[PDB]
Each structure stands twice: as structure tokens, then as C-alpha cells.
Amino acid sequence: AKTPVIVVPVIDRLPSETFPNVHEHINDQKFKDYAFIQWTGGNIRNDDKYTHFFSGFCNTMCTEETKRNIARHLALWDSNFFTELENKKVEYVVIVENDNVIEDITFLRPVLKAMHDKKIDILQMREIITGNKVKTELVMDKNHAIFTYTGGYDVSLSAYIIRVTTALNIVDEIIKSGGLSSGFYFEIARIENEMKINRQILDNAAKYVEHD
Numbered sequence: 001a002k003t004p005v006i007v008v009p010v011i012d013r014l015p016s017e018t019f020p021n022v023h024e025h026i027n028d029q030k031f032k033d034y035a036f037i038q039w040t041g042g043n044i045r046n047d048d049k050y051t052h053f054f055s056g057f058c059n060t061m062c063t064e065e066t067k068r069n070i071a072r073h074l075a076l077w078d079s080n081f082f083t084e085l086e087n088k089k090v091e092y093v094v095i096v097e098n099d100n101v102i103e104d105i106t107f108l109r110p111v112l113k114a115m116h117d118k119k120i121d122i123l124q125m126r127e128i129i130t131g132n133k134v135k136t137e138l139v140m141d142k143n144h145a146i147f148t149y150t151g152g153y154d155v156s157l158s159a160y161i162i163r164v165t166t167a168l169n170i171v172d173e174i175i176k177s178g179g180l181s182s183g184f185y186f187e188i189a190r191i192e193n194e195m196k197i198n199r200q201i202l203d204n205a206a207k208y209v210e211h212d
């Protein structure tokens with residue numbers, strides 16, 4: 001059962017630029033270890049039914065820009081594709097916005113194994129909060145240690161690995177609780193905390209996933 005590796009377009013360029021050293025083709029989708037995919041749903045105007053991701057209010061309304069960015073992900077988490085991955089017992093998906101570059105995907109294999117073994121639900125592959133962190137070793141890649149630290153109020157959806165049922169549970173709770181309103185990323189953090197979801201931040205993420 002292959003691990004989906006999903007490119008989410010946020011700028012206009014080919015998905016091959018995100019994975020410049022992958023020698024295959026990346027297939028589109030809407031509505032050897034890896035299945036490379038580009039997810040094209042969840043986009044702006046086509047969202048009369050993404051309204052349940054957000055509360056009725058906020059300001060006058062939330063900016064179409066902030067909503068659009070998070071909607072792309074929530075739509076993916078809430079897709080028939082994901083529920084089918086749950087049916088098919090696929091454990092994790094790798095999700096990367098296409099303004100990132102991952103030159104070397106070999107780190108993913110030992111990282112995914114270690115995540116499985118250590119019951120990690122989310123590996124966030126972009127850092128947000130600066131300052132000293134409490135690191136723990138995740139796994140050794142060739143001759144270098146890969147470290148993580150526990151996530152807090154530093155959610156980013158730029159690039160991450162997530163357990164399929166974890167993604168499904170989060171977006172379902174968002175829908176249940178009436179949609180996001182203000183402090184989108186804070187609320188995602190709180191939902192994860194309430195569910196005792198284990199989110200780790202990849203330390204020195206920039207080494208593995210270069211952000212544009």
C-alpha cells in the first residue's frame with residue numbers, strides 16, 4: 001500500500017519543480033514506495049460547499065485569501081480520496097505546497113517508519129517559532145540524526161506528513177464545531193491538543209524542505 005505524496009498548488013508552476021529529482025510523473029486529482037499526486041480541489045471560486053469549513057461571521061467576512069489557503073487543505077482532508085484511504089488502511093500522506101522544493105526525498109522512508117513506530121500523528125516540515133526548543137531524536141538518516149520538537153501554537157500547512165485518520169478527525173471536528181472563525185491556526189492547534197494528537201515539528205526543516 002503506497003504512501004501518497006501530494007502536491008498542493010499555491011503558485012503557478014509544474015509539480016516537478018517541487019520534486020526535481022523524482023523520475024516519474026505526477027497525476028492530477030479533484031473532488032515505488034510513493035504515489036505522486038497533484039491535488040487541485042479546494043480552490044477559490046468553486047467553494048459553495050466549503051462554507052461549512054468556516055463560521056457564518058468573523059469580520060464583515062474573512063478575506064478570501066486566508067480562507068482559500070486553509071480551504072485547500074481542509075478540502076483535501078475532507079475528500080472522498082481520504083475516506084477511501086481510510087477504507088484501504090493507508091496510514092500516512094505527505095502533503096507539500098508547491099512553493100517548496102524537496103531535492104532529496106530519501107529522508108522520507110526512515111522518517112515514515114519512525115513516525116509509525118513512535119505513534120507520531122503529524123510531522124510538520126516547516127518551522128514557525130524561533131528560539132530554543134527541546135529536541136528529541138526521531139531517526140538516523142545516513143550518518144545524521146534527525147530531530148523533532150513537540151508542536152505548539154506554530155501550525156503551518158506549508159509541508160507536512162499526516163496520519164489519514166488524524167486529518168479526517170480534525171476536519172470533522174471543525175465541521176462539527178461549526179467551522180473556523182478567527183485564529184484559524186490557533187484553533188487547529190487546540191483541536192489537536194484536545195484529541196491528544198501527537199504533532200512533531202521537524203527540526204532544521206529547511207534542510208529537507210526548502211521554502212519559496
Ligand SMILES: [Mg+2]
Nearest residue numbers: 097099100158
Ligand atoms: Mg507554502
